[PDB]
C-alpha cells in the first residue's frame, strides 16, 4: 500500500513547487508520498525513458553490447555536451538525445510497443513519432509506475536478460561509496507553453547498507532556474528519513 | 608488448621504495611501466583476491545472487567495520576478510583450484589453507597478471557467466561521474622484514570518456608509514598522464 505524508509538503511550499515525491522502503508494498492524486498522475517521461530505451536497445541487438561507442562525426547537436564520442553509460548520463533517437528508430514501432507492454511502462502510447513519443508525443507515466519499473529492474525481474538489466544498472550509478550506492536518472521536458508547464524528473533507488529505497520525483516547471529543486526537495525529504544525513 | 618509462621512478626513488606501476591504455597490448623486471614479479594478492573469490563464489552458488546478504552472527570480529550485515558490494568495499574466508571454505579446494586455472590467476598455488592461501599462503600474482585478469573481467571474457562478471564489476565501482567511472580494489599483506617484506596493492581500471585504462600497482612494505604511498605514487603518475582531471 501507499501512505500520504502531508508533512513532506513543507519542502514543496518553501519553493512554491507543484510536484510529488514517492519513496519506498525495501519494496513497492511499503511506500509514502506527499500527494496521492499526483503520485499516480502520468506525465511525459522525457529523458527518464532512456532507461527502458537502453534495455530495449540491448535486448533487440540494436546496441551490440555495453562496450559500444556512439561516435560523434561532427553533426551539430542541441548541446555541446553531446558533441563527442559517448559510451552507453555516458550517453545515458549526459542524456544524449540524438543517440537514443537513432536507437529508437532502429528498434522500430513493433518491438518498442512489445517491450513497453512487457514492462508495464505507463500508458504504453508511443504515438507522435518513433523518435519523439517519450518527449513530445503521447507516452505518459506516473511516479508510482517509475518506482514499480525501477524495482523490477533492481530485482532483475523485467522481461529481459539479467545481463542487459545489469549493464543498464551500472550505467545508472551516480554516487558510489563502500556502503552507500545510488542509481538515478533525471529528466526535463522543457519549460512548456502558456499555462501548460513542463515536467522535471528525478528517479532511481538508494542502497544503504543492506536496505534499499526506491524513489521517484516530478514537478511542474516553466524555467530552467528551478531545475535544481528536482534534486534538493527529494534529497531533503530522504535526509529527513535517515537515508544518509 | 610492455614499454618502460624510466621517468616514472621519480616518486619511488624520492621515497626510497621498491615498487612497480603498470598502466595500459585501451588494452593490455599497449602497456607501460617504470620497471620491466618487477612488472612480471609475483606477490601475495592479499585482498585483491576478493575479486576472483567473489566471482567464484557466485559461479559455484556459494553466493546465491547479487542480493546475497552476509549476516553478522554477533560474535566479535577483528574490525568493528565488519560487525554488521553486508551486501556483496559492502563485503568487498570494506574488505570483510571473514566473509571471504567463509566463502572460500564453502567453495572448497577442488573448485577454487579449478577456477584459478580457468582465470590463469598467478602461479595458481592455493597451498597454505583454503581460507588463507591468498593472505599468507603460496599464491602469487604479478602486476601484469592483474591487468590481464582485470581486462578479461572488463570485457566479460573470464571463464564465468557474464551475469556474475557484471555483478562483481558494479560491486567494484569506487568513483562515478557521467563520463568517468572507476573500478578498483586495494590489498596489503602486512609489514614484513627488509629482507622478506610485505606487499601493498592498488589495482583496477579507469573508464574516461570513451577510453579505458588498466592499472596495477604494488610495493614492498617494510615500514608501516610508507603504506600511504601505495595510493599517492600511482595517483601522481596518473595525474601526470592526464587521466585524472
Ligand atoms: C531529458 O529529459 C532532456 C535532457 N536531459 C536533461 C536532464 O534532465 O538532466 C535535460 S536538462 C539540461 C542539463 N544541463 C542543463 C543545465 O543544467 N542548465 C541549463 C542549468 C539542462 C536535458 C534537456 C532531453 C529532452 O534532452
Ligand atoms: C586485505 O588485503 C586487508 C586489508 N587490505 C588493506 C589495504 O590494502 O589498505 C588493509 S590496511 C588498512 C585498511 N586501509 C588502510 C590504509 O590503507 N591506510 C591506513 C594507509 C589500513 C588491510 C590489511 C584485509 C585482509 O584486512
Author numbering:
A (entry chain A), B (entry chain D): 21 to 265
Tell me what the authors wrote about this structure, in their words.
Carbapenemases are the main cause of carbapenem resistance in Gram‐negative bacteria.
The new crystal structures show that L117 is situated at a critical position with enhanced Van der Waals interactions to L155 in the omega loop. This could affect the supply of new deacylation water molecules required for hydrolysis and possibly the carboxylation rate of K70. But most importantly, L117 leaves more space for binding of the hydroxyethyl group in carbapenems.
